[PDB]
Design a protein around this ligand. Structure first.
Ligand SMILES: CCCCCCCCCCCCCCCCCC(=O)OC[C@H](COP(=O)(O)OCCN)OC(=O)CCCCCCCCCCCCCCCCC
Ligand SMILES: CCCCCCCCCCCCCCCCCC(=O)OC[C@H](COP(=O)(O)OCCN)OC(=O)CCCCCCCCCCCCCCCCC
Ligand SMILES: N=C(N)NC(=N)NCCc1ccc(I)c(Cl)c1
Lengths: 171, 113
């Protein structure tokens, strides 16, 4: 349609059919018909005119593809030329991961509004997915500081890997 | 290398400073400023007075500056020639290291909590 329903899923809509139990006319029914006549139709035609001009001038833009380069683990110590590329790549991935957490947060918030008073039970998958991704993001990037770098990230991972190894040794 | 010589012969194997050298342009500018100050202290029209005098200020500065820049370049070439030849003469004092990657070198992590 406009976005991808996989990335931003919406459960199928279920609308109850009107069941008027009163003889009185419904004010919402006629205001809706007025809104379509007075607002929707003129606004729709104005848009179709604009969509005609765009179809006469069709041009394209692209999503940049970033080749993968060796990460900071493969860089010799103080080799700026290799460090620079690994460092820039790590920075790009840091921004992308930030937007991944935003997507999962957006799903979580959309579910909370959609489900209403039942959100507590009907948004368990969204909450679980959000909890896991925030754990992964925290492990990668939390506590690096303002002057974060791929090096500080790697040093934080190695420290974490060491702790996991020692506990495993206790087992 | 030659005793009490401003520009030894070996300095001729180096390329001379270009006449459009940015450093030389600055020196010429200093000569222009000196010419202006000369008019001002003597209470003459600063920009207009004595264009022959102002020309000679620019020319003398550029002339001297060209040779100073040439000796400057020569002395830095000599410094590197000496430094690299010494490294070659004493390999055991400048040994090539084995370069570890960051995946092997252990660096301690300091959290910013
Ligand atoms: C591409 C050029 C860029 C310019 C860079 C300037 C850098 C500073 C250069 C210092 C040398 C300036 C020339 C020496 C001063 C002589 C000027 C003077 O004494 O009075 C101004 C004079 C006009 O007054 P008058 O005495 O009546 O002479 C009539 C001529 N029209 O003559 C004039 O009409 C004006 C002459 C210039 C006035 C200079 C004013 C003083 C500037 C010093 C401030 C520090 C400079 C900025 C610091 C950063 C350097 C980039
Ligand atoms: C380190 C990097 C930066 C480089 C720095 C370079 C600095 C060194 C360069 C030399 C600096 C001094 C240059 C002064 C230039 C102004 C000379 C001038 O215009 O003189 C005008 C006139 C006298 O000129 P005149 O003697 O007739 O020329 C023949 C010289 N044999 O009559 C006059 O009205 C002159 C009066 C104003 C001058 C002040 C008094 C000094 C007298 C100098 C006499 C002329 C010297 C000729 C300079 C030639 C230098 C190559
Ligand atoms: N520190 C001292 N007493 N002497 C001294 N300047 N040693 C430094 C050696 C040196 C530096 C620049 C150049 I150009 C050159 Cl040819 C030689």
């Amino acid at each position: 349609d406009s976005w991808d329903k996989d990335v931003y899923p919406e459960p199928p809509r279920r609308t109850p059919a009107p069941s008027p139990q009163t003889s009185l006319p419904n004010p919402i029914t006629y205001l809706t018909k007025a809104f379509d006549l007075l607002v929707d139709r003129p606004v729709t035609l104005v848009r179709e005119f604009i969509e005609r001009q765009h179809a006469k001038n069709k041009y394209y833009y692209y999503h940049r593809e970033f080749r993968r380069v060796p990460d900071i683990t493969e860089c010799q110590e103080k080799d700026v030329l290799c460090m620079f590329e690994a460092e820039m790549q790590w920075r790009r991935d840091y921004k992308v991961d930030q937007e991944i957490v935003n997507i999962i947060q957006e799903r979580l918030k959309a579910c909370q509004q959609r489900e209403g008073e039942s959100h507590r039970q009907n948004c368990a998958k969204e909450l679980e997915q959000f909890t896991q991704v925030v754990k992964a993001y925290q492990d990668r990037y939390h506590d690096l500081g303002a002057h974060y770098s791929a090096r500080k990230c790697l040093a934080k991972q190695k420290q974490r890997m060491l702790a996991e190894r020692k506990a495993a040794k206790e087992a | 290398r030659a005793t009490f010589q401003f520009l030894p012969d070996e300095a001729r194997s180096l390329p001379p400073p270009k006449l459009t050298d940015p450093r030389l342009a600055f020196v010429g500018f200093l000569g222009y400023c000196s010419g202006l100050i000369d008019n001002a202290i003597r209470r003459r029209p600063v920009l207009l007075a004595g264009l022959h005098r102002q020309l000679l200020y620019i020319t003398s500065f550029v002339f001297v500056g060209y040779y100073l820049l040439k000796r400057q370049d020569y002395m830095y070439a000599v410094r590197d020639h000496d430094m690299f030849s010494y490294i070659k003469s004493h390999p055991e004092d400048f040994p090539e290291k084995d370069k570890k990657t960051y995946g092997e070198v252990f660096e301690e992590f300091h959290p910013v909590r």
